[PDB]
C-alpha cells in the first residue's frame, strides 16, 4: 500500500521538476544584462525611538504611513508617531512574551500574539478613554508566530502546530483551517488584493493558499533550512523568501520555480526579515550580523548596508508610500532610515 | 488647533514616560526563571513547591517569576530564542524504557553550545535521589565507564547513604560537568545541586545561586573575572 503511493509521489515530484526545467527557457540573470545599476544607496538614520525596556521583536507599519505599532518582551505594546517621536498609546499586556502584532488597515484594531496561545484584539476607539480587551482568541495548541489583518472582521493567524487559521472576530470562531505544513510555520504576508497568500514553514517549503476555497495550490521547495521571512512583490505575482541558509530566493507564482538566488561569500549569518520597496527594485534584508543589506532585486548585487544596529535585527518594515523604512532590533531601539 | 494638538501629544508623551519610569523600576528588580525540564521528571511537583504557566513569589523581599513551559511542540529551536533575557534557566532531570539521561545530556549540550544562550547561566537539579538509593539492589548496563570510575575525595558524602549510590550520583554530576567545563569558555557558568522528590530547601538553593549569578555579572563588567 505504501510502496505504490511513495513511488507514485516520487514520479509526480520528478514530473513537476521536469515541467519546471521545460519552462526554464532562460534565467532572470541572463535577460537582465543590459540594466542600469542602482548605484550606492547610502541611507541616513533620521529618527531614533527609545521607549522600550526589553528587546523589540516585531513591528508593522500602518496604511497611513504615520503611526507604527511596536511589540517588546517587557509586556508593553507601544504606538509610535513617526514624525514627532511622541508615544501615543502604551498598553500593558497580560502575558510577557509577544511574537506577533498587527495594525488593522482602518486603524481601529491592534492584534497581538505570543507563546500564550491567546490572540488579543484591542479596539483603539476607546470612547471611555482607556484601552480594553475587545476579544481574545484561543484555538491554537503550539505558539502564535504571525498574524495579519485582511480587513476589520477577518484575521489570518499562523501557529506552531503546523496549521494556519482564519478567524472571525465578531463570532470568535474559526472559519476554516489550513493543514498542509509538516513543521513550525514562521511568518506570512498578504497580497495587496487580499485574495491569495503564501506561508513559509520550518520544512523549507512555501504553500500558496486560497483564502476563500480553503485549499493550497502550490508548494515551493527551493531552500535548504527553515524559512523565516517572506514578502510579496508589489504587483502580487511574485515573492521573496529568506531562510537560515543565508541565501535569499525570489519565487514566481506563474513560473512555479525560483527566478534568482541572492548570496555573498562573506555572509554566513541567518536571515530574520525581508521586505520589498514601493517600486520593488530594492529588496531590504535584515541579517543576523547586526546590519541590513540593500539587495538589487534584478542584478543580485549589494546596493548598500545599514550598519546602525548593535544587536540582532529582528523586524523590518517599509511604508506603503516608500517614504521611510523602520527597523527593529534587540538593542531596544527603532531605527528609521530615510 | 495646530498648537493644541502639539501640546496634547506632549502631555500624552509625558504621562506614558512617567508610566514607563514607574514600570522600568519593577522590571529591572524582579528576577526571571525558566523551569525547563523533561516530562519524566516531576516538573509539576517543582511548580507546586493555555500554553505557558506562570508562578509569582518572593524570597527575602526579592521577587521571582518562574515560567513553566506547558503544552508546546517538541521542536524547541525557534521559540527558545525568546528566552535569552531571563536571569536563570532551571534544568531538572530525574535520575531514573529508553536512555533518558543520554537525551538529557544531548539537550543540555545543545542548550550549552547554542550561540544565543552563551550569556545565560543554568541551575541544575538531579531529582529522584531516593530512587537511586532504591536501585542499588535492582544503571551500569548502559554505562560501561561506571566500573572505571572512582569517588572524588573533595566531595563529602552524607551519613546513611550507600557509597555505591553516591558514586552513581557523582558520575551523573560529572557527565554534565565535563560538557560544562569543556565548552563553557568562562562567559557563563553551571551550578549542579541535589534534590529529593520531597524537599523544601531547594528554593533557598535557587536564591543562593541567583544572587551569585548577578554578582558574577557585575564582576564581568569590571573585568575582574
Amino acid at each position: 500500500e505504501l510502496d505504490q503511493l511513495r513511488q507514485e509521489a516520487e514520479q509526480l515530484k520528478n514530473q513537476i521538476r521536469d515541467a519546471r526545467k521545460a519552462c526554464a527557457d532562460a534565467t532572470l540573470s541572463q535577460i537582465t544584462n543590459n540594466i542600469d545599476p542602482v548605484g550606492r544607496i547610502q541611507m541616513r538614520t533620521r529618527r531614533t525611538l527609545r521607549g522600550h525596556l526589553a528587546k523589540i521583536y516585531a513591528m508593522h507599519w500602518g496604511t497611513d504611513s504615520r503611526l507604527l505599532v511596536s511589540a517588546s518582551q517587557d509586556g508593553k505594546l507601544i504606538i509610535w508617531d513617526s514624525y514627532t517621536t511622541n508615544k501615543v498609546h502604551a498598553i500593558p499586556l497580560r502575558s510577557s512574551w509577544v511574537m506577533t502584532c498587527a495594525y488593522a488597515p482602518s486603524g481601529n484594531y491592534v492584534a497581538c500574539g505570543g507563546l500564550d496561545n491567546i490572540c488579543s484584539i484591542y479596539n483603539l476607539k476607546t470612547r471611555e478613554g482607556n484601552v480594553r480587551v475587545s476579544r481574545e482568541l484561543a484555538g491554537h495548541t503550539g505558539y502564535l508566530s504571525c498574524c495579519r489583518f485582511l480587513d476589520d472582521n477577518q484575521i489570518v493567524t499562523s501557529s506552531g502546530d503546523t496549521t494556519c487559521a482564519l478567524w472571525d472576530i465578531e463570532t470568535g470562531q474559526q472559519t476554516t483551517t489550513f493543514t498542509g505544513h509538516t513543521g513550525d510555520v514562521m511568518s506570512l504576508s498578504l497580497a495587496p488584493d487580499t485574495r491569495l497568500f503564501v506561508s513559509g514553514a520550518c520544512d523549507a517549503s512555501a504553500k500558496l493558499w486560497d483564502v476563500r476555497e480553503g485549499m493550497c495550490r502550490q508548494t515551493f521547495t527551493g531552500h535548504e533550512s527553515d524559512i523565516n521571512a517572506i514578502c510579496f512583490f508589489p504587483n502580487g505575482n511574485a515573492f521573496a523568501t529568506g531562510s537560515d541558509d543565508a541565501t535569499c530566493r525570489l519565487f514566481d507564482l506563474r513560473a512555479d520555480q525560483e527566478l534568482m538566488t541572492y548570496s555573498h561569500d562573506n555572509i554566513i549569518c541567518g536571515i530574520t526579515s525581508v521586505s520589498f520597496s514601493k517600486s520593488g527594485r530594492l529588496l531590504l534584508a535584515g541579517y543576523d550580523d547586526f546590519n541590513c543589506n540593500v539587495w538589487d532585486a534584478l542584478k543580485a548585487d549589494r546596493a548598500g548596508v545599514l550598519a546602525g544596529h548593535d544587536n540582532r535585527v529582528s523586524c523590518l518594515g517599509v511604508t506603503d508610500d516608500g517614504m521611510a523604512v523602520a527597523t527593529g532590533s534587540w538593542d531596544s531601539f527603532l531605527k528609521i532610515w530615510n | 488647533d495646530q498648537r493644541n494638538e502639539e501640546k496634547a501629544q506632549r502631555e500624552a508623551n509625558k504621562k506614558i514616560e512617567k508610566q514607563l519610569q514607574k514600570d522600568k523600576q519593577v522590571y529591572r528588580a524582579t528576577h526571571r526563571l525558566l523551569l525547563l525540564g523533561a516530562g519524566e521528571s516531576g516538573k509539576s511537583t517543582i511548580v507546586k513547591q493555555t500554553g505557558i504557566f506562570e508562578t509569582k513569589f518572593q524570597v527575602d523581599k526579592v521577587n521571582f517569576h518562574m515560567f513553566d513551559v506547558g503544552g508546546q511542540r517538541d521542536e524547541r529551536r525557534k521559540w527558545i530564542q525568546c528566552f535569552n533575557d531571563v536571569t536563570a534557566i532551571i534544568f531538572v532531570v530525574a535520575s531514573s524504557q529508553t536512555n533518558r539521561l543520554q537525551e538529557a545530556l544531548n539537550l543540555f549540550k545543545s542548550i550549552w553550545n547554542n550561540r544565543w544562550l552563551r550569556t545565560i547561566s543554568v541551575i541544575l537539579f538531579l531529582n529522584k535521589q531516593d530512587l537511586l538509593a532504591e536501585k542499588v539492589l535492582a544503571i551500569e548496563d548502559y554505562f560501561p565507564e561506571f566500573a572505571r570510575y572512582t569517588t572524588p575525595e573533595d566531595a563529602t558524602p552524607e551519613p546513611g547513604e550507600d557509597p555505591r549510590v553516591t558514586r552513581a550520583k557523582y558520575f551523573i554530576r560529572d557527565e554534565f560537568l565535563r560538557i560544562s567545563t569543556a565548552s563553557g569558555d568562562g562567559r557563563h557558568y553551571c551550578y549542579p545541586h541535589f534534590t529529593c522528590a520531597v524537599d523544601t530547601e531547594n528554593i533557598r538553593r535557587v536564591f543562593n545561586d541567583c544572587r551569585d549569578i548577578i554578582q558574577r555579572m557585575h564582576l564581568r563588567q569590571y573585568e575582574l573575572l
Partner: nanobody
Amino acid sequence: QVQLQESGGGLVQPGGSLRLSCAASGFTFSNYKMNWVRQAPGKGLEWVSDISQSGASISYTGSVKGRFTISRDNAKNTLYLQMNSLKPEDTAVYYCARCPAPFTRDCFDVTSTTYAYRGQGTQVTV
C-alpha cells in the same frame, strides 16, 4: 528539495558486519553537522552517534562506544556507518538525520512529532 535516501540493511546474524550509506541530495552537505538516530520497537527515539562538519569531533552513545565506526565522505557527500560486533539487542529503525542550521554546534533532532529533517528510515533486525 532537501532529500535523504538511506541505503543498506537486511537480516544479519549476531557477530556479523554491515555498512550503511546516506544519499544527501539538494543541499550543501559540506556545511551541515549530521548524526544517526534510531527508534527501538516499543521505545522512543534515542541518539546513536554524530559527526561534525570537518569530521574531527566524533561522539557515540555509551553502550555502542568503541563498537561502531562512523565515516563521512565529502567527496561524494555520502555518510557511511560500519557496524562490528553486532548484538541481538541493537535491532531498531535507523534515521540518517541532519541538523537544521549551518556553521553551528547545537542540534535539535530528537523530535518524534513529525520532525521534517529526517529520512524515512531503514530496518535492522537480529
